[PDB]
Symmetry: C5
Subunit: 238 residues, 5 copies
């Protein structure tokens, strides 16, 4: 349930941290790597009262990335301490850290201005499914977007939502407000069992006016498989 809180409540920080494993890790004996894995598992357990850590295998799906953590915390200083500790582990010392993005959860700004049927439909957000694919797309809006007033942006966001309606059940969505914490305005996060549905969702959105106000979209677009930390780290241990 407290996990559920971190994943759904407003005012929670989400951090996305990507890493590559060094060649000399694999040039290491599996026995020492099995110990290294236990160390990391230990550290995550240690931090489990303060933060939520979820793990994703990017190796073979995202260029120049092997591992991603999605970390939820009420204070970014907690996230900093965990990540710093993680990077100083025996395993962490052989990771080449890559990307790092942060954003905060907020109560919706526009939904209140939508038609009742659309507000009702928006109650649906993903479905049951084990070990889904996950996608992360950072976005920066253009200056023209911010110059628009709230009514105009509400209209454009209604169009966005309208195009997305066929994907409410098949794609789980989460939005993080990132401006000022790194070089992007939003971090978008998705889970799906059906990548072709996600692909179709993005194509649908490409047609809407709001999608013309993206100064930057992706770079990187991170694609991975969601799974237990143990299961991923085990692959790294063999």
């Amino acid at each position: 349930a407290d996990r559920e809180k971190l994943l759904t409540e407003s005012g929670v920080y989400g951090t996305f941290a990507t890493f590559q494993m060094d060649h000399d890790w694999w040039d290491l004996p599996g026995e020492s790597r099995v110990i290294s894995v236990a160390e990391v598992k230990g550290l995550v357990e240690q931090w489990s009262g303060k933060i939520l850590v979820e793990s994703y295998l990017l190796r073979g799906l995202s260029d120049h990335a092997d591992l991603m953590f999605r970390v939820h915390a009420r204070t970014l200083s907690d996230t900093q301490q965990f990540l710093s500790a993680f990077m100083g582990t025996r395993l962490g010392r052989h990771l080449t850290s890559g990307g790092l993005l942060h954003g905060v959860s907020k109560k919706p700004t526009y939904v209140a201005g939508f038609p009742e049927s659309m507000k009702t439909e928006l109650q649906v957000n993903g479905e049951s499914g084990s070990r889904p694919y996950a996608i992360v797309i950072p976005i920066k809006k253009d200056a023209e977007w911010w110059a628009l007033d709230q009514e105009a942006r509400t209209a454009l966001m209604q169009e966005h939502t309208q195009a997305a309606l066929p994907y409410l059940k098949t794609v789980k969505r989460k939005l993080y407000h990132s401006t000022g914490l790194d070089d992007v305005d939003f971090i978008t996060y998705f889970e799906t069992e059906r990548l072709e549905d996600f692909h179709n969702l993005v194509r649908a959105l490409q047609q809407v006016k709001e999608f013309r106000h993206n100064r930057r979209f992706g770079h990187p677009t991170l694609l991975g498989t969601m799974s237990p930390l143990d299961e991923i780290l085990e692959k790294f241990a063999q």
Copy 2:
């Protein structure tokens, strides 16, 4: 056969994975390099039930790139597992990635709106020919393209096709729909025995209105020769 199903059927994922051999590979004794080559060959055979792996010599034709795999799979999870295993082999650990792109095969979007005679012409796609050149060109369309309605895009794609007609036999083509899986919209893939024919094809298409709408075209443009994997890997065993 099932090879052909994977190469022709809709709903199949194609993955393009580029690699460059690190120089420290060459410090390994030749005998050790011989054994490492053998290991990759067996991994590929182990995966021969689930996925199709084809290999291309980029060395000496594409900057900063030695090897490309084109992998077809019904589930990207399988491609992930194969590439992660490959990257973990001793040969694999001495490769750096030069790119990783994915897309899905789809039934055509525009062809049904084409004249009936054009639909018939598109039944031809390449001809028999051993060890052709292969070219891969990633493409990202501009926002203006997606803003156009279906009728407009159909007419633009009819013009594209019209310009391409002389090349239907001499250049084999395949299109992958990539949006949402990486930072491009399409991966285009070609085979040809005559590069000057491919050059002339691209020149013909540069004139059509659909061309201005290519926000990104190439970067990289990958040029290689299609080859059995053993002959590529032999070079690194010398």
Copy 3:
């Protein structure tokens, strides 16, 4: 006293130097790394008086960065000599640079044209807070900005200031004039205990007309926590 002077007076150079520890550092014997950390602490101590060095933990908050120095000096030569001496330490030898930016403090250009009530409220600048978050955002203005006359720019800066007013207490600010010393026009620096306040501040400023004139905004946006240097370097001697 003299520290407070360096931090508030005009004609003072502020330099922002970012560093990341290389891996092969962690291959050096433990007590070897304990001793190398001692060198840096004495080096920073020596240069006191001449220059002011403040340290920030970027590890786990900024991508590819562990440490940032903010250095204040009346003579940029002095900063050069310190940084070069720092980079030459055994610890320094294992660091890669993730950025180097300079700017000078100046008496305000526009404030004299603001309403008296605004001049008065700008007397507030942050509040007492230990170990705050720190954010650094480099900014390059477009050519159209410099083409505007002083009256036009004054109005735009009044609008900027108006949007920022709610945040005067909770966000400390400092501006550095950078044009000609590197590839940006300004370095902006902020401290806060409340990151969502800083986020909301930047969102407020995105709407003002002055914003569209930022040709470059961030790249990198640096986020860290203010810390004594010994606590940062400690992490590398584990």
Copy 4:
């Protein structure tokens, strides 16, 4: 002798392959490096029946580049095999590729439409000179260029030529048609004993209408000295 043919006939591929030497090359004993230089010279001699290889010293004139080959071949397959063999030599194993561009020679497209006097003038193409400077400028045209009718492009290319006329004797020129083989449309190649004349030529062309149609010009602009291969390789055997 067929050398003259490869350098002048249509349908021939020119390839520009740039390399930078690893720093660890210098840790090798001089004796080892002497042997490795013989291996490269002999490889070029072995290939001299099939392809033409010319060598250029870029060290000290082009950033991040020591050596360039210009290779002419009837098929790129032969060039691929040569360059792959070259990269497999003892010396080649220590080189990092800094560029690889290909294009074909073609009979002129526009010259037939020029005045008779211009046609006659164009028969002059450089003059005798030992060890000239060489410059390679890759060029990509904008979409607007390809949208222009042939008559319009002819007029633009006549203006280009008109501006270049003063330089026919002091600057040798060669054009390669590259579209589809890499990320550029043209590779331009020049030889001159007088770099100020080449500078002044490019300045003359910057004013012509055809200039604005360059989406990309240079990046890199390669500057080198043409030299016997043995003289370039001697530097590395020191």
Copy 5:
């Protein structure tokens, strides 16, 4: 005299070569590094007849840059051979390049069109100053600039000059014409004892109409201290 002629005469090539020292240079024993640094001074003296070499400490002022040479020669082949010879010293063997730019000195294009008073003012160029700061800014003009007639460009350059007149004494300047020798049109070089003056000069020039014709300005903007070589060399021997 000979020095002064190279620094003042037309038709002289100026080369700007930037270098960054490898990390593993410090893994080397102190005495090994002591000998290494000794042979560089003798090389410069060897070349004292043909070329002028001046040295600048970039370490701690310019990102990813330790040393710059400004080299003047009447033949760029000479500079090549010096820099090639330099990069093949035990010290040079450990240098990675961070930039290489060339340009030629020319008699002014526009000054003859200025008012006689402005012509007289331009006779002033800086003042004798020991160990000044040095700044290097590469510039590329847009196509629109080259499309303007001579009369129009003269007016724009008079405006440039007018804005710069207050800085004639405190900022020394030199202009190199670079087009065709690398990817920029101009190299600008400045010496000053007073960085805030230089900063203020660039600010004045940002306002003039000629400024919005700079397609590229900086990237990199190099900042350094002009220094005897021994003073830079010494730091690498610690």
